[PDB]
Amino acid sequence: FRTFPGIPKWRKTHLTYRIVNYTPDLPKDAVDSAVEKALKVWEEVTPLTFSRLYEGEADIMISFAVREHGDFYPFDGPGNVLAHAYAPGPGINGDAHFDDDEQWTKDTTGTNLFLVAAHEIGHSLGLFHSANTEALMYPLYHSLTDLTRFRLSQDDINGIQSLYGPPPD
Ligand SMILES: COc1ccc(S(=O)(=O)N2CCCSC(C)(C)[C@H]2C(=O)NO)cc1
Ligand SMILES: [Ca+2]
Ligand SMILES: [Ca+2]
Ligand SMILES: [Ca+2]
Ligand SMILES: [Zn+2]
Ligand SMILES: [Zn+2]
């Protein structure tokens, strides 16, 4: 694994997230599940717990966007940059933006929202890219992984616990 520079990490175990908008590519219900499951992944190996807001500024603001969308890094159309996110911190920090010029699916017939969400949310949590090929934090986008056999890799578990520790009990 690999954390960020100056090793940013939230100074609190409980984080709030908010889904700011919805992609026309999937039923609102599928977008919710992906985010909740992307969150389960990390929540299971650390003291981190999460809750949802429907208003106010949440730590982890999630949203879909196209091209220019409010920051300095406009999205680039279909493919290539799938989504980007920010390290822990105030305001735009911790937020995750998804490119809608991608076709977000619940399976692998395009860009799986879960798989890509878990990885972006690790960013919000403070993890940078991993050199480990079998790691979820690898800049790894592969459409050949059954969803069925997915499991966070020891590399991912190592790096996030480096920051927050193992589960309390
Ligand atoms: C499994 O999770 C993911 C999430 C994003 C990408 S990506 O294709 O958008 N991307 C890899 C390819 C270069 S661009 C990037 C730096 C913005 C980077 C990425 O990991 N965003 O955090 C790939 C796999
Ligand atoms: Ca934020
Ligand atoms: Ca793109
Ligand atoms: Ca789309
Ligand atoms: Zn953005
Ligand atoms: Zn990434």
Structure tokens that stand for 97 in this block: 């933006």
* Ligand 1, pocket-test mutation among 81, 95, 155, most atoms within 8 A of CB: 81
Q: Is 97 in the pocket of ligand 1 (CB under 6 A)?
A: no
Q: Distance between CA atoms of 85 and 92, rounded to whole angstroms? A: 9
Q: Is 66 marked within a binding site?
A: no
Q: Which residues contact 11 (CB under 8 A, 6 or more apart)?
A: none
| Structure-determination approach | X-ray
Partners of 139 in beta bridges: none
What domains are defined for the chain? 1-169 (3.40.390.10)
Q: Distance between CA atoms of 84 and 95, rounded to whole angstroms? A: 9
Q: Distance between CA atoms of 59 and 54, rounded to whole angstroms? A: 12
Q: Distance between CA atoms of 139 and 144, rounded to whole angstroms? A: 15
Q: Is 135 in the pocket of ligand 1 (CB under 6 A)?
A: no
The residue count of the chain comes to 169
Q: Distance between CA atoms of 68 and 91, rounded to whole angstroms? A: 18
Confirm if 20 and 27 have CB atoms less than 8 A apart.
Answer: no
For 46-60, give the secondary structure using H, E and C.
Answer: CCCEEEECCCCCCCE
Hey, whose CA ends up nearest to atom 3 of ligand 1? 116
Structure tokens that stand for 64 in this block: 């879909």
Q: Which of 44, 55, 57, 120 is catalytic?
A: 120
Record the resolution, in angstroms: 2.6
Q: Distance between CA atoms of 78 and 86, rounded to whole angstroms? A: 21
